[PDB]
Design a protein around this ligand. Structure first.
Ligand SMILES: Nc1ncnc2c(CN3C[C@H](CSCCOCCO)[C@@H](O)C3)c[nH]c12
Ligand SMILES: Nc1ncnc2c(CN3C[C@H](CSCCOCCO)[C@@H](O)C3)c[nH]c12
Lengths: 231, 239
């Protein structure tokens, strides 16, 4: 069993990286991949950099070089669901691009030609993540997570998402891209992220203040999930 | 340009069947591999080793495709071919556009001070390789085609007039064309330090008629971009 884990930023992967035993590092395509064992379980941890293309590049490299059985996307997120506070957990049941528009040719809003309109997360990974949430006593919401190449900061950017995707529970910049690569390679995928801000006009300030907390809570989740999936 | 292996190997990327089909047909001793939803066709085009990839549409599809092409085929350079929406007023359907630079028109991390279109960790724009631009300009002249060289912008939207077009023109007044893949491939190429250029042809002018124009003139754009790419591959490999 080899678990793939992808995060965008140094702050989002640094805690997991430290826990890796027999840590070997691969540097390529502007990405770093840390391989070794996390509490006995073989893992490959990718630091991808930010945005859709960075994530797609990273995911493709991870899949080709390390051949993980599943991928977990971790990190921060902007919370959309009203019951989410900073530090709470979001789990994807589905991912969609909020910034894709080929509606001129009759595709669904968010849907790219040749792709499904959304990417369903793996049911077994979701069930496992829910068990982790219960074990860790955390507040969490499971639902649609939407991705774009924008940091959402209130105003019209936020309103447009809430309008087009009223059931979206969180927004970020990589998950859907990773879900797309995984789809094309038939690899099970789940997003397990923690809230750093609520994507409003103070989101940049909240992000700066609470990125560390979001990394700590998503790390707790991911460490627990790795262990549950090994068994 | 110095070949990495024995001889020069040219990577070519197109999104759509219509954009790659003419080039594919010209490849000698062609072999096909399928992976990650992408098809790669390898062989010789007029004696020059090429690897042609059909990526599918949009930023992620192109990024995944470009990564696979680099990893599996190790090309010395990449040319992105296909159609585009023309923004410069002098462009007509069939005309050529060459990138001197690419930017994302839909990337916005301005809340943290980044330039509009710039993603953190990237330059605000990706400059295309000078040698590839110069060879493309030489081909344009020899074939006596009308062409514009400039900023090409990419995003995950098909531009069709109204506010979508107005926003691009406002944010990128120097942009000469718009499409959905080129900047993604440039970004991948940047990270791997591989020379890149866009050589596309105009299918529409991204206005309220662009869906109708695109459908009628996709074939013409494929034809002219193919003509350019074929000519460029020859120029790159043989002086
Ligand atoms: N409000 C928000 N909008 C979009 N994405 C996010 C996120 C998730 N990610 C965090 C990060 C925000 S952009 C980085 C800003 O820091 C620049 C220093 O590198 C991207 O990888 C997306 C948290 N809040 C968000
Ligand atoms: N007006 C435009 N906006 C964005 N991109 C393009 C392009 C470039 N490509 C053409 C293609 C259009 S989206 C697929 C539409 O399929 C309709 C089937 O004929 C994308 O790969 C981008 C030409 N005109 C454009």
């Amino acid at each position: 069993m080899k678990i793939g884990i992808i995060g965008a930023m140094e702050e989002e992967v640094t805690l997991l990286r430290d826990k890796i035993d027999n840590r070997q590092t691969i540097t390529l395509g502007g990405c770093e991949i840390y391989t070794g064992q996390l509490n006995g379980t073989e893992v490959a941890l990718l630091k991808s950099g930010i945005g859709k293309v960075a994530a797609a590049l990273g995911a493709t490299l991870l899949l080709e070089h390390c051949k993980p059985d599943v991928i977990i996307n971790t990190g921060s997120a902007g919370g959309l669901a009203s019951t989410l506070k900073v530090g709470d957990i979001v789990v994807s049941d589905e991912t969609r691009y909020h910034d894709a528009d080929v509606t001129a040719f009759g595709y669904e809003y968010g849907q790219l030609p040749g792709c499904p309109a959304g990417f369903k997360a793996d049911d077994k990974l979701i069930a496992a993540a829910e068990s982790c949430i219960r074990e860790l006593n955390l507040n969490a919401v499971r639902g649609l997570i939407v991705s774009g190449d924008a940091f959402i900061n209130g105003s019209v950017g936020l309103a447009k998402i809430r309008h087009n995707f009223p059931d979206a529970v969180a927004v970020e910049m990589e998950a859907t891209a990773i879900a797309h690569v995984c789809h094309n390679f038939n690899v099970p995928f789940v997003v397990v992220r923690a809230i750093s801000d609520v994507a409003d006009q103070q989101s940049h300030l909240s992000f700066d203040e609470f990125l560390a907390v979001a990394a700590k809570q998503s790390t707790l989740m991911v460490e627990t999930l790795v262990q549950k999936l090994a068994h």
